[PDB]
């Protein structure tokens, strides 16, 4: 039930690879007291909910078209906004991607109908040009065939 710059909704499955910046002793220490003694599954539920916020925001800051085509710009916008927040949690996203982009409303199916129509021209024109030549040739074939038959049959009558 997402929304965009033009309000239009979307349904999307984004994917993220979270890791703790163990390399920075500062950030590690900061995150450690947040997650010490907690399981990987518990840490997962906590992190998951933060990411959706930034997703929802970026989605609102983008159009459907940019969201599916411009995945690179999307990812940059996601890192630009989401990184600074997650860093205070001492958590880092190795990478962000989109696994799915859909909705029950026809918005998405529309953009490609132009091509259905284009290729239908091409197909229809090929078919018609070809059948045209076929009929042209077949007709020209019929002429001499029937003509020669009558011309010969005339001699049979004579």
């Amino acid at each position: 039930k997402v929304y965009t710059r033009h309000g239009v909704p979307i349904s999307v499955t984004g994917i993220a690879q979270v890791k703790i910046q163990g390399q920075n002793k500062e950030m590690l220490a900061a995150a450690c007291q947040m997650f010490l003694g907690k399981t990987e599954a518990e840490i997962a539920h906590i992190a998951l909910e933060t990411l959706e916020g930034h997703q929802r925001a970026i989605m609102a800051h983008m159009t459907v078209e940019e969201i599916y085509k411009d995945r690179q710009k999307f990812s940059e916008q996601v890192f630009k906004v989401a990184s600074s927040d997650l860093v205070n949690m001492g958590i880092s996203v190795v990478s962000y991607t989109l696994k799915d982009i859909h909705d029950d409303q026809d918005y998405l199916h529309s953009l490609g109908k132009a091509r259905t129509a284009q290729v239908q021209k091409d197909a229809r024109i090929g078919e018609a040009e070809a059948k045209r030549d076929a009929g042209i040739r077949e007709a020209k074939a019929k002429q001499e065939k029937v003509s020669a038959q009558y011309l010969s049959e005339i001699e049979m009558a004579k």
């Binding site: 411009d70 989109l98 953009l111 490609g112 091409d122 070809a130």
Partner: protein, 150 residues
């Protein structure tokens, strides 16, 4: 791994279904290798597969979004470079390298693709049919001629 992708969208919006395939390994350089170990020491190949798969689909969906159907099935050479240019710098940060990437299938529920070949179905039919008729010319004339002479 088989990097499947479904109900895609393209540079001209048209959807697709694609089955991509990736050949991958841990990067055999100590820096990247150490970085990768921190994700899977004490974990399975199935875990490695499940994680890696999602990353590839991201770049795959992105590249598909940037290309036409023709480029997608035909320009495999440009596609592969683009896959190397975009997915490698990203996945490289995981300490993992895609040795090679390829497309195993290109399909969809809608007729889009099937239409592009009709043109030549008709080309060859036309050539064939012309031939058939011009043989009947030859046959019919000579047959008719023989009957006269007899």
């Amino acid at each position: 791994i088989l990097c499947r992708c479904e109900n895609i969208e393209t540079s001209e919006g048209v959807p697709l279904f694609v089955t991509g395939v990736a050949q991958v390994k841990i990067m055999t350089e100590k820096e990247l290798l150490a970085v990768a170990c921190e994700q899977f020491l004490g974990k399975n190949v199935q875990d490695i597969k499940n994680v890696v798969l999602q990353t590839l689909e991201g770049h795959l969906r992105s590249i598909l979004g940037t290309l036409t159907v023709e480029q997608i099935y035909q320009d495999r050479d440009q596609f592969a470079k683009l896959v190397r240019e975009v997915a490698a710098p990203d996945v490289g940060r995981m300490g993992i390298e895609i040795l090679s990437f390829t497309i195993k299938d290109v399909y969809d529920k809608v007729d889009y693709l099937s239409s592009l070949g009709k043109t030549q179905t008709a080309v060859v039919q036309r050539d064939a049919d012309i031939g058939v008729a011009e043989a009947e010319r030859d046959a019919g004339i000579r047959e008719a001629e023989c009957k006269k002479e007899m």
